[PDB]
Design an enzyme around this catalytic site. Structure first.
Site, PDB file in Angstrom:
ATOM      1  N   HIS A 193      31.157   0.469  43.713  1.00 51.48           N
ATOM      2  CA  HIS A 193      31.711  -0.548  44.597  1.00 51.48           C
ATOM      3  C   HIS A 193      30.967  -0.653  45.920  1.00 51.48           C
ATOM      4  O   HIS A 193      31.266  -1.556  46.708  1.00 51.48           O
ATOM      5  CB  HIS A 193      33.180  -0.261  44.888  1.00 51.48           C
ATOM      6  CG  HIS A 193      33.937  -1.458  45.371  1.00 51.48           C
ATOM      7  ND1 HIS A 193      34.647  -1.460  46.551  1.00 51.48           N
ATOM      8  CD2 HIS A 193      34.094  -2.691  44.834  1.00 51.48           C
ATOM      9  CE1 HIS A 193      35.209  -2.644  46.723  1.00 51.48           C
ATOM     10  NE2 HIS A 193      34.890  -3.408  45.695  1.00 51.48           N
ATOM     11  N   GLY A 247      36.832   5.271  53.496  1.00 48.37           N
ATOM     12  CA  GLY A 247      35.911   6.098  54.237  1.00 48.37           C
ATOM     13  C   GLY A 247      35.764   7.497  53.689  1.00 48.37           C
ATOM     14  O   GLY A 247      34.859   8.225  54.119  1.00 48.37           O
ATOM     15  N   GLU A 275      32.161   3.870  37.625  1.00 49.49           N
ATOM     16  CA  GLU A 275      32.149   3.890  39.089  1.00 49.49           C
ATOM     17  C   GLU A 275      31.144   4.880  39.674  1.00 49.49           C
ATOM     18  O   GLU A 275      31.246   5.238  40.850  1.00 49.49           O
ATOM     19  CB  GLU A 275      33.542   4.181  39.665  1.00 49.49           C
ATOM     20  CG  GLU A 275      34.335   2.948  40.107  1.00 49.49           C
ATOM     21  CD  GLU A 275      33.544   2.011  40.999  1.00 49.49           C
ATOM     22  OE1 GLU A 275      33.466   2.271  42.216  1.00 49.49           O
ATOM     23  OE2 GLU A 275      33.002   1.013  40.479  1.00 49.49           O
ATOM     24  N   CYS A 280      35.558   7.590  50.313  1.00 55.07           N
ATOM     25  CA  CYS A 280      34.845   7.270  49.086  1.00 55.07           C
ATOM     26  C   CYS A 280      33.434   7.837  49.149  1.00 55.07           C
ATOM     27  O   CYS A 280      32.784   7.816  50.197  1.00 55.07           O
ATOM     28  CB  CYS A 280      34.802   5.761  48.877  1.00 55.07           C
ATOM     29  SG  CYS A 280      36.302   5.079  48.151  1.00 55.07           S
TER      30      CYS A 280
HETATM   31  C1  LIG Z   1      37.061   3.876  49.202  1.00 55.92           C
HETATM   32  C2  LIG Z   1      35.917   2.820  49.275  1.00 55.92           C
HETATM   33  C3  LIG Z   1      36.200   1.697  50.307  1.00 55.92           C
HETATM   34  O1  LIG Z   1      37.136   1.769  51.022  1.00 55.92           O
HETATM   35  O2  LIG Z   1      35.330   0.580  50.403  1.00 55.92           O
HETATM   36  C4  LIG Z   1      35.450  -0.418  49.405  1.00 55.92           C
HETATM   37  C5  LIG Z   1      35.889  -1.738  50.065  1.00 55.92           C
HETATM   38  C6  LIG Z   1      38.466   3.381  48.834  1.00 55.92           C
HETATM   39  C7  LIG Z   1      39.413   4.562  48.886  1.00 55.92           C
HETATM   40  C8  LIG Z   1      40.808   4.149  48.712  1.00 55.92           C
HETATM   41  C9  LIG Z   1      41.261   3.190  49.795  1.00 55.92           C
HETATM   42  C10 LIG Z   1      42.598   3.454  49.957  1.00 55.92           C
HETATM   43  N1  LIG Z   1      42.794   4.993  49.652  1.00 55.92           N
HETATM   44  C11 LIG Z   1      41.753   5.419  48.918  1.00 55.92           C
HETATM   45  O3  LIG Z   1      41.568   6.513  48.517  1.00 55.92           O
HETATM   46  N2  LIG Z   1      38.359   2.845  47.476  1.00 55.92           N
HETATM   47  C12 LIG Z   1      38.937   1.536  47.111  1.00 55.92           C
HETATM   48  O4  LIG Z   1      39.505   0.867  47.908  1.00 55.92           O
HETATM   49  C13 LIG Z   1      38.737   1.062  45.658  1.00 55.92           C
HETATM   50  C14 LIG Z   1      39.893   0.227  45.134  1.00 55.92           C
HETATM   51  C15 LIG Z   1      41.231   0.998  45.244  1.00 55.92           C
HETATM   52  O5  LIG Z   1      41.247   2.154  45.487  1.00 55.92           O
HETATM   53  C16 LIG Z   1      42.552   0.255  45.029  1.00 55.92           C
HETATM   54  N3  LIG Z   1      43.521   1.151  44.416  1.00 55.92           N
HETATM   55  C17 LIG Z   1      43.822   1.024  42.981  1.00 55.92           C
HETATM   56  O6  LIG Z   1      43.284   0.201  42.325  1.00 55.92           O
HETATM   57  C18 LIG Z   1      44.860   1.958  42.318  1.00 55.92           C
HETATM   58  C19 LIG Z   1      45.150   2.041  40.970  1.00 55.92           C
HETATM   59  C20 LIG Z   1      46.132   2.975  40.815  1.00 55.92           C
HETATM   60  C21 LIG Z   1      46.779   3.410  39.491  1.00 55.92           C
HETATM   61  O7  LIG Z   1      46.444   3.460  42.027  1.00 55.92           O
HETATM   62  N4  LIG Z   1      45.645   2.818  42.964  1.00 55.92           N
HETATM   63  C22 LIG Z   1      43.046  -0.261  46.379  1.00 55.92           C
HETATM   64  C23 LIG Z   1      44.475  -0.814  46.243  1.00 55.92           C
HETATM   65  C24 LIG Z   1      43.030   0.846  47.422  1.00 55.92           C
HETATM   66  C25 LIG Z   1      37.459   0.227  45.726  1.00 55.92           C
HETATM   67  C26 LIG Z   1      37.113  -0.431  44.352  1.00 55.92           C
HETATM   68  C27 LIG Z   1      36.364   0.371  43.283  1.00 55.92           C
HETATM   69  C28 LIG Z   1      36.024  -0.285  41.937  1.00 55.92           C
HETATM   70  C29 LIG Z   1      36.432  -1.737  41.674  1.00 55.92           C
HETATM   71  F1  LIG Z   1      36.127  -2.316  40.481  1.00 55.92           F
HETATM   72  C30 LIG Z   1      37.175  -2.541  42.738  1.00 55.92           C
HETATM   73  C31 LIG Z   1      37.515  -1.885  44.084  1.00 55.92           C
END
Ligand SMILES: *[C@@H](CC(=O)OCC)[C@H](C[C@@H]1CCNC1=O)NC(=O)[C@@H](CC(=O)[C@@H](NC(=O)c1cc(C)on1)C(C)C)Cc1ccc(F)cc1
Ligand SMILES: *[C@@H](CC(=O)OCC)[C@H](C[C@@H]1CCNC1=O)NC(=O)[C@@H](CC(=O)[C@@H](NC(=O)c1cc(C)on1)C(C)C)Cc1ccc(F)cc1
Lengths: 186, 185
Positions: free
Chosen positions: B45, B150, B76, B152
């Site tokens: 991502h 952050g 990923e 990630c």
């Molecule tokens: C880290 C990367 C980042 O922030 O930059 C990308 C814009 C981030 C960490 C999470 C944020 C919130 N808490 C974390 O640990 N990663 C993301 O945001 C990914 C997407 C998500 O984490 C979603 N959560 C879910 O989908 C989910 C599913 C379940 C069962 O529980 N939660 C958001 C709602 C936070 C980034 C990503 C990766 C791969 C993709 F195809 C799309 C988006």
């Protein structure tokens, strides 16, 4: 860059698990170290009032003392006595008796956003005087780590010693107020 | 709360000090784990391009491969070959060979804002499938810590094992992509 020891990490972990709470004032959320019984510490700039949120439970502050040395200079420590059933593990025996320099310290934070984070800060130097946000302050410890807001109240430890709490920084360096055995045992 | 061992903290610190850099894409900053030579990993991502900032030095990306399993499902992980003189300590022997569960793991972050922070996350469970931001993803590890953006790219380790990198969370739990020895050999 900076590194800490195994026993150092384990010593920090034990202090965090038993002797820290999340404190919230009007000024924000802070890591709070409980020292003994119902006595804890927090940076003076937190502006403690007649009540405080301890782990999101509003608690009456029975007493608070903003510490100043004999030159009437800010020390940035405020000792608070809490009206709360639970008592603290006595850790006064881990407090230093003298001002000193330290190696391989660890900064530990316990807030809602970071409920258990550990940061090795490296060599800690007795910095002495500091102009902290415009307030002259004494007995300051310095470490070269990019500290941030929300790490104030963070506990700085070495293996066997709780040496300070974080109180300031400039973007490239962090500053902690000394903790001394004399503050709590008289 | 969650707890780790001294040896656990010391192993993570050694990986961070020797095998991590700050990576910055158009999508933000990520912790980046170097595995060997000039090969590193980053969450897909991050949308890596033909150049990337490594410790604030723009570096030419010689190759990148977004990993998908044999069901053509997202994993990923993106492996990047970097035009960068200095090479990485080979840590492939710390990579697990198979999917598994882990105890008292540690999540480590190396970004500009948090240069080397360590978080005990507790028991890591093989969660398997995840709908991550709408993209079906496989080989996911789960741990109950309120992870944040952050973190990630953050490296998940146990003593002697580099087990994954952080890729997502839901506010109460964090999710990391598995790292496997077969990916690099
Ligand atoms: C880290 C990367 C980042 O922030 O930059 C990308 C814009 C981030 C960490 C999470 C944020 C919130 N808490 C974390 O640990 N990663 C993301 O945001 C990914 C997407 C998500 O984490 C979603 N959560 C879910 O989908 C989910 C599913 C379940 C069962 O529980 N939660 C958001 C709602 C936070 C980034 C990503 C990766 C791969 C993709 F195809 C799309 C988006
Ligand atoms: C944590 C507490 C806070 O944010 O305010 C509570 C309401 C924060 C940590 C620092 C923020 C930036 N990085 C940190 O580590 N503490 C503060 O903001 C104190 C004030 C400062 O740190 C100032 N810095 C300096 O004065 C300074 C001096 C030198 C040589 O380098 N930096 C800010 C400009 C960042 C809060 C405070 C404490 C005591 C006072 F009298 C006034 C303000």
């Amino acid at each position: 860059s900076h590194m800490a020891s195994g026993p150092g990490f384990d010593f920090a972990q034990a202090i965090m698990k038993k002797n820290t709470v999340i404190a919230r004032t009007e000024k924000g959320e802070f890591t709070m170290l409980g020292v003994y019984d119902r006595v804890a510490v927090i940076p003076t700039h937190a502006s403690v009032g007649e009540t405080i949120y301890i782990n999101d439970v509003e608690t009456k502050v029975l007493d608070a003392c903003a510490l100043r040395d004999l030159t009437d200079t800010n020390l940035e420590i405020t000792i608070v006595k809490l009206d709360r059933n639970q008592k603290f593990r006595d850790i006064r025996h881990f407090l230093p008796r003298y001002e000193d320099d330290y190696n391989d310290a660890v900064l530990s934070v316990h807030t809602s956003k970071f409920p258990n984070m550990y940061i090795p800060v490296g060599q800690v130097t007795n910095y002495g005087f500091l102009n902290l946000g415009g307030t002259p302050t004494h007995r300051i410890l310095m470490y070269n780590f990019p500290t941030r807001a929300g790490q104030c109240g963070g506990v700085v430890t070495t293996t066997g010693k709780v040496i300070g709490i974080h109180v300031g920084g400039n973007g490239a360096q962090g500053f902690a107020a000394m903790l001394l055995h004399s503050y709590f045992s008289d």
